[PDB]
Every structure is written in structure tokens, then in C-alpha cells.
Design a binder for this molecule. Structure first.
Ligand SMILES: [Ca+2]
Ligand SMILES: [Zn+2]
Lengths: 343, 80, 80, 320
DNA sequence: CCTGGATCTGGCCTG
């Protein structure tokens, strides 16, 4: 639980809330900059490098056949395994939502060079609506893979939306979607165990089971302490989706997931209420068919974190998260960033 | 009022126990005090001290908001 | 002669209706533009050979087309 | 005014000025949200409420702790309501204009208005003390004027009303005031997209308005001429001010404009920038980044305001 | 013994 302050060079004005870190082969990469991508880096993805508590954001070019994607501001990330990376949904800089799936993978690597490849996957069937704040995961059942997508937040539909309430958002429908990446097919599944919308939840994947927990429901304005488990088996016919409500859940929203050990996850960050901050850390020790969410010791927070109202971060991948604080009135550099080790 | 402002900024850093400090530690003490004064006393921060800032600063509510950021309590009763 | 060319060219993009305020300066804007261009290229070779500011390009290149299209430019300005 | 009225009524005995509650009650006749009006067809994503005045320009942007921190204050008029108010106070001018052109007064022909739009941010507007968000010390105003009104009589087109002093401060009618930064793109798009949605809806319909005992019919043409070069490059999606592509109206580059300097033609548009940004993000030809930018001519972002190809003259004077 | 790129770096364009 070592907590260190991290300085950063001349691109601190590029990190916004809602960024995303992809960990390719122990190397961290930044995505989701602020504003449309400048001529200093036309792709938008960067080389997230820290040593000696100093950070530098070098550019990272794409392949020839890749597609130049907009900087999504609240997407759903996923770690496939020919190792690749799945992003879907989120806000563009012009505040509309995107319904695409982009797949990120390394085209070539040279002596400290990287060139990604980004292709766009087309979804047919029950196409989910463009949204943000949701979550996607992949499961491995009977030697096959399937992308499970739970709902998030979006605008009003295109007939009920008026310009006097144009940016008003509403929680999505609580369906569950099964996305087949190698064919571009999506089938919705309505489940009676899931009644409310949910957004900014954390989701832990396994062989065939996903454990969604936390998450703020907009329509009734609560952060309910629930814990669902979705069991997906893949027979020859339709895949059978089964949600069972479990007890023992916690009540957060937009907390940060990290994987320290195998079958071991830490929950850090997020909010308990509006005026309240989740200042404790939840140790989630998995099993083959069990979830044991327990409280660990808390990391000694400094006084500029204990009195902020906002913070945000993501998972660097190697058991270390990277969170940022709003500095103060912009007037200097507007953000203080930290790092946090987890064993 | 500016002299008391410097006292407040020097008490949240415990300079009576850290008699040496860098530039950046003092800058961070100033930024922390600015954020907490805006959060508590609804005061935007300024570089040139005014008179209305001076009347709104020399209250007991501001020393409660500042005493929220001192670790000790002898410094609390001294500032009080 | 540079300033004479520029003052022959200014009341076309400044007039609120240049076809009914200065048609004589409007009807030969192309000749004054080319004369201004060759005097930038020849007598001022040390500054505008390989680079030119944007508003010089907008002023010399486009504005007969814009004044044919809309009718005025100073009416559609932004001083209001 | 209260001091002046109070001491004039105290000296003369008479009541020369009206007390300011009467001013307030006579003020609401001209503020937005007073008159009846009917769109034909109805406007998409626009309610038909006819009493909407000063509304929060956030338009219900979610201010919770879980998502993107917004820190701007905005107030605005609904666009069609403001166009109705600005058409209704200059009723007498339209009537006198058609009178002086040997037209009737009972005529209800389809008027073609032309409305000149302009937006520019400001600096050093000081933030106040007190409760509220962490507002930046910059303001952005969106405003419009009404340049010409042309009615069709017979076969040809006659004009009725003309703004006689078009760059006045008496005719730049305000529409939206936000405390944002025009450098920032997220909050700018978030505040400004309702007005663009209303304008895009209003571009393809008709307004029916009762003007002096007679219902008459209007339709609009919006021209966004009043933006400086920085805002046009930042909004229409082109590269910034120091690129190698210079002109926001054509595809020329800086060196080849230093060589030719006279012989060009206006080429850029809004729909062309839409097709170009789709070309940039779709990448249909698998080209590398440099030849992609050379194919797409510097378009590398999604435009979100249709701005006409024209030139601001004030900053042209200052630049020369 | 370069040398071919990484990387600054100061000038220029608009506010
Ligand atoms: Ca300005
Ligand atoms: Zn040009």
C-alpha cells in the first residue's frame, strides 16, 4: 500500500477524467486524451512511462491498415487473449456517444518502438445502444469465448429527447448482451434477477462467471450494496445465461479494479455517496465458485487526498493503480497525480 | 491579514518541526489552504490581498477551517 | 507603392456595400492583387519567399469570389 | 432610476416617472416567452411550449460526483423563442418597410429572413466569491443579428427590412452567455450543442406568427460569419493556426500559396468536412498517417457547427 | 567514426 506522488512533464494538460490505460506486454499505454488529437501526436494513444516518480508521454504510431479512432472518454475496456484489447462505447470530444468496437493489438515492435493496430468490429443482431459507464468482459466456456456486456448510461432515445434537456442522461436497460468478436454477433438476454439500471460498476471475470458489484443506479439515485454473478455456459444451442443474486456485496461506484495475484483483486477508489468518498480498500479473494470480499488495511492517505471531492484513475496492470487529484483553481496545471502499489 | 495568512500556511506544514523545507512543499501547503478555504469559507483565492478578504478572513470560522488541517492540537489552541 | 496598392484594396473588403460605394476599385481588384503579389515577391524577397501570412493569402486570393457570393464583407464582420 | 424617480416625485408633487414595478410589468412584453407561434411542420426534438424564457444552458447536464466534472455557468434563450421575440419587437419596421416598397399590409407571403450569427469568447472576466462551481475566468457569448428580410412579390424578390448600421452594439442580440473557455472543447460542445440542434431543426420548416392582426409566415437562413480564424479552425475541425494548410476556404498549402498567391477558388464546406472526417477515421485505403493527412487535406476532427466560407474583416485589418 | 534517427528548439501564425 505504498503511496507516492508522481510528477509529469509538458503533457499534464492532456490527462482528463475518464482516461484508459492498456497494458501491452508489461508496457503501459495511455488512451483518451483531452480534445481532438494534436499534430504532435495524431493517433491519440501515448506511451505511459514512469521512472523515478517521473512520467513522460511519447507518441505511438499506428499500422498502415489501422483505423484512427476518436478519443473515447468513458469506454468499456477488456483484456482478450494474438493478445488484443477491446474498447466499446463512450463519449467523443463533441459529447456524442459511439457505438463502435475497436480492437487494439501490436502490429510490430522494434528496439523500444511500438506500432499498434486498431481495427473496427461491426455488430449485428441485438446491437446495444451507444452508451458509457458500462462494462464489458469475456468468458471462456467449453473452449469458446463470448463477450458479456452489461448496461450503463446513455441519453434519452431519439424521440423523447428535447433541446431543453439535451444532455440529460438515463440509465440503460438491464439486459445482458453476448458479443461474439470473431463473427460480429450480439444477442440480448433479459434476466428477471436484474431489475435496475447500473453504471460505473466493477466487474471481475473468470472462466464462465462475471461478478458485477457496486454501481450507481440513476433512476432511483442509490448506490445499492448488491453482488450479482452471471454464469454463462456455451452449448451447441443458445448460450444459457443465469444471474444469481449473492449476498456480501459492497456499496461503491466507479471504483478501480486491479489484479495483484491470481484469483486476487483489490477494490480501491470510488464513492459511497455524493459528499462521501470510499477511503477504504476492499480485498476480493476469489475462488473457483466463491467470493470472499474482505476489508484490508487502509493505505495512509495524505491530506490533499482526504479533502478533495473528486478523484479518478485506472489500472496500470502490474498490481499498481494510478490515481489523480484536482489540484486547485486552474489560474497551476490543475491536477496532482499519485501512484499506489498493491503488494 | 496577509501576515496571518502566512501563519496559517506555515502551520499546516509544521515548520516548527520541519525547519527546513523546499520550495514545492510550501507551494503545496499554499494550494491545500486555498482549496480548503474555497470549500469552507466560499473564498476564491487572490494574489493581492483586499479588504473584503481581510474582513472575511479574520473570523473564527476560518480558524476552524484551518484547524481542520493541522495534525496537532496544541497548535489548535494556540491559533484559537 | 505598396501602401498605395493596399489602400486601393482596403475599401473593397471594408465597405458595407462595395458595389454601390466603390465599383471602380472593385472592378480591378485582380490587377491590384497581382501587382501587390509581384511587389511582395520581387522587392521583398527577403521575407515572403517561401512563407506568407494567412490574411495576406485571404486578402489577395479570395475576396472577389466572396464579394460576388454574398455582396459585402464588412457587413458580415464581427465588430458588433 | 429609483433615486431619480423618487426625488422627482418628491419635488414636483406629480408622478412623472413610473415606479419600477410598473417597469417590471411592462418589461415582460418584450422578454422571450410571450407570444403565440406555430411551426409548420413541428420542430424535431423541440417542445411546443410557448412560454420558455431564460433557461439553464447546461440543459440538464449531469453534475454528479461519478462522472465528468463540469464547472461552467450558462444561461440562454431557446432559439426559436428568441427569434420570435426579435421578430415581434421590430414588427413596425417590417410594416413600414413593406409600405415604402408599394406592398400591402395584409400580405402574409413567405418571408425569407437572413440571420447573421457570431460567437467569440472573452478574457479576464473576474470570478466572484461565494457558493458555486470552480468557474474559469473566461466568458463565451453566442449572439445573432437580423440582417435582411426579403419577401417574394410577383416573380422576383423584394426586401422589406435592412439593418442600416449592421455592426452596431444595438443589433447584436444576445442568445447564450456561458462562463466557459473557448480553448476547452468538452464544455464548449456540451453547452453549445442544444442551440445547434435547434438551428438544424429550424433550417427546414416554417414559422407562423401573428403580426398586426394577420398571421404571416417566415423561414430562416443562418449565416455564421462572425467567428475569428482561431475559432473557425477550432470548431470546423481543421488544423490549428500554424499548420502548413492555411486557408479555411481552400485546400492550398503555405509554400504553394507563397508561390502562386492569387489563383485559387473556395473549396471547403461543412458537408465536405464531414465526408473528410469520415475518411480520416474510417481509413478506407490503408494509407500511413502522412499520406492520409495529405489525402484528407488537414481535416482531423469532427466538425460540429456549420460555418459559412467567409472572412472576418476586423481581424483582417489587424493582421495586415 | 560515423550516422540515422529521437529529440529539442526557436521562429511564426492566430488571438
Ligand atoms: Ca475574444
Ligand atoms: Zn485560400
Amino acid at each position: 500500500m505504498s503511496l507516492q506522488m508522481v510528477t509529469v512533464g509538458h503533457n499534464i494538460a492532456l490527462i482528463q477524467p475518464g482516461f484508459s490505460l492498456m497494458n501491452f506486454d508489461g508496457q503501459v499505454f495511455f488512451f483518451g486524451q483531452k480534445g481532438w488529437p494534436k499534430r504532435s501526436c495524431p493517433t491519440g494513444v501515448f506511451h505511459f512511462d514512469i521512472k523515478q516518480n517521473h512520467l513522460k508521454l511519447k507518441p505511438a504510431i499506428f499500422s498502415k491498415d489501422s483505423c484512427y479512432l476518436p478519443p473515447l472518454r468513458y469506454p468499456a475496456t477488456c483484456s482478450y487473449k494474438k493478445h488484443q484489447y477491446i474498447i466499446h462505447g463512450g463519449k467523443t470530444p463533441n459529447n456524442e456517444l459511439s457505438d463502435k468496437i475497436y480492437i487494439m493489438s501490436v502490429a510490430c515492435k522494434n528496439n523500444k518502438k511500438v506500432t499498434f493496430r486498431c481495427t473496427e468490429k461491426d455488430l449485428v443482431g441485438d446491437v446495444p445502444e451507444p452508451r458509457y459507464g458500462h462494462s464489458i468482459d469475456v468468458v471462456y466456456s467449453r473452449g469458446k469465448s463470448m463477450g458479456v456486456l452489461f448496461g450503463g448510461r446513455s441519453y434519452m432515445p431519439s424521440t423523447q429527447r428535447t433541446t431543453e434537456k439535451w444532455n440529460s442522461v438515463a440509465d440503460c436497460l438491464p439486459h445482458v448482451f453476448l458479443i461474439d468478436f470473431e463473427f460480429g454477433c450480439a444477442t440480448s438476454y433479459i434476466l428477471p434477477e436484474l431489475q435496475d439500471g447500473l453504471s460505473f460498476h466493477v466487474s471481475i471475470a473468470r472462466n464462465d462467471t462475471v461478478y458485477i458489484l457496486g454501481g450507481h443506479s440513476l433512476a432511483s439515485n442509490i448506490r445499492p450494496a448488491n453482488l450479482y454473478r452471471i454464469r454463462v455456459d456455451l452449448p451447441l444451442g443458445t448460450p444459457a445465461v443465469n444471474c444469481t443474486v449473492l449476498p456480501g456485496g459492497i456499496s461503491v461506484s466507479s471504483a478501480i479494479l486491479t489484479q495483484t495475484n491470481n484469483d486476487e483483486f483489490v477494490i480501491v477508489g470510488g464513492y459511497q455517496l455524493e459528499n462521501q468518498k470510499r477511503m477504504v480498500c476492499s480485498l476480493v479473494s476469489l475462488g473457483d465458485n466463491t467470493i470472499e470480499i474482505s476489508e484490508m488495511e487502509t493505505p495512509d492517505w495524505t491530506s490533499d487526498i482526504k479533502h478533495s471531492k473528486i478523484w479518478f484513475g485506472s489500472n496500470m496492470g502490474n498490481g499498481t493503480i494510478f490515481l489523480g487529484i484536482p489540484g486547485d483553481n486552474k489560474q497551476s496545471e490543475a491536477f496532482y497525480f499519485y501512484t499506489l502499489r498493491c503488494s | 491579514a496577509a501576515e496571518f495568512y502566512k501563519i496559517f500556511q506555515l502551520e499546516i506544514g509544521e515548520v516548527y518541526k520541519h525547519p527546513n523545507a523546499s520550495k514545492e512543499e510550501r507551494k503545496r501547503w499554499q494550494a491545500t489552504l486555498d482549496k480548503h478555504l474555497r470549500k469552507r469559507m466560499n473564498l476564491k483565492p487572490i494574489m493581492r490581498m483586499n479588504g473584503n478578504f481581510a474582513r472575511k478572513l479574520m473570523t473564527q470560522e476560518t480558524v476552524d477551517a484551518v484547524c481542520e488541517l493541522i495534525p496537532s492540537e496544541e497548535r489548535h489552541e494556540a491559533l484559537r | 507603392e505598396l501602401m498605395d496598392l493596399y489602400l486601393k484594396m482596403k475599401p473593397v473588403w471594408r465597405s458595407s456595400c462595395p458595389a454601390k460605394e466603390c465599383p471602380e476599385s472593385l472592378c480591378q481588384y485582380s490587377f491590384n492583387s497581382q501587382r501587390f503579389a509581384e511587389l511582395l515577391s520581387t522587392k521583398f524577397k527577403y521575407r515572403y519567399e517561401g512563407k506568407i501570412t494567412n490574411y495576406f493569402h485571404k486578402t489577395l486570393a479570395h475576396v472577389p469570389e466572396i464579394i460576388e457570393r454574398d455582396g459585402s464583407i464588412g457587413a458580415w464582420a464581427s465588430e458588433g | 432610476y429609483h433615486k431619480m424617480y423618487r426625488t422627482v416625485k418628491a419635488i414636483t408633487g406629480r408622478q412623472i416617472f413610473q415606479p419600477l414595478h410598473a417597469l417590471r410589468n411592462a418589461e415582460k412584453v418584450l422578454l422571450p416567452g410571450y407570444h403565440p407561434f406555430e411551426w409548420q411542420p413541428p420542430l424535431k426534438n423541440v417542445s411546443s411550449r410557448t412560454d420558455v424564457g431564460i433557461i439553464d444552458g447546461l440543459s440538464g447536464l449531469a453534475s454528479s460526483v461519478d462522472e465528468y466534472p463540469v464547472d461552467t455557468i450558462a444561461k440562454r434563450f431557446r432559439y426559436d423563442s428568441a427569434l420570435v421575440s426579435a421578430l415581434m419587437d421590430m414588427e413596425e419596421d417590417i410594416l413600414e418597410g413593406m409600405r415604402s416598397q408599394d406592398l400591402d399590409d395584409y400580405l402574409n407571403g413567405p418571408f425569407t429572413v437572413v440571420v447573421k450569427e457570431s460567437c467569440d469568447g472573452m478574457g479576464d472576466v473576474s470570478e466572484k466569491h461565494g457558493s458555486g462551481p470552480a468557474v474559469p475566468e473566461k466568458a463565451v457569448r453566442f449572439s445573432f443579428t437580423v440582417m435582411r428580410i426579403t419577401i417574394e412579390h410577383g416573380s422576383q424578390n423584394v426586401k422589406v427590412f435592412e439593418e442600416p448600421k449592421p455592426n452596431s452594439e444595438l443589433c447584436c442580440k444576445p442568445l447564450c452567455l456561458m462562463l466557459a473557455d473557448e480553448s476547452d472543447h468538452e464544455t464548449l460542445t456540451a453547452i453549445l450543442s442544444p442551440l445547434i440542434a435547434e438551428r438544424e431543426a429550424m433550417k427546414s420548416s416554417e414559422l407562423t406568427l401573428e403580426m398586426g392582426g394577420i398571421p404571416r409566415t417566415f423561414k430562416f437562413i443562418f449565416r455564421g460569419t462572425g467567428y475569428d480564424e482561431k475559432l473557425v479552425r477550432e470548431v470546423e475541425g481543421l488544423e490549428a493556426s500554424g499548420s502548413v494548410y492555411i486557408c479555411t476556404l481552400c485546400d492550398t498549402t503555405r509554400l504553394e500559396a507563397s508561390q502562386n498567391l492569387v489563383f485559387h477558388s473556395i473549396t471547403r464546406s461543412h458537408a465536405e468536412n464531414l465526408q473528410r472526417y469520415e475518411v480520416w477515421r474510417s481509413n478506407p485505403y490503408h494509407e500511413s498517417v502522412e499520406e492520409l493527412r495529405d489525402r484528407v487535406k488537414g481535416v482531423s476532427a469532427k466538425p460540429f457547427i456549420e460555418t459559412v466560407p467567409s472572412i472576418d474583416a476586423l481581424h483582417c485589418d489587424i493582421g495586415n
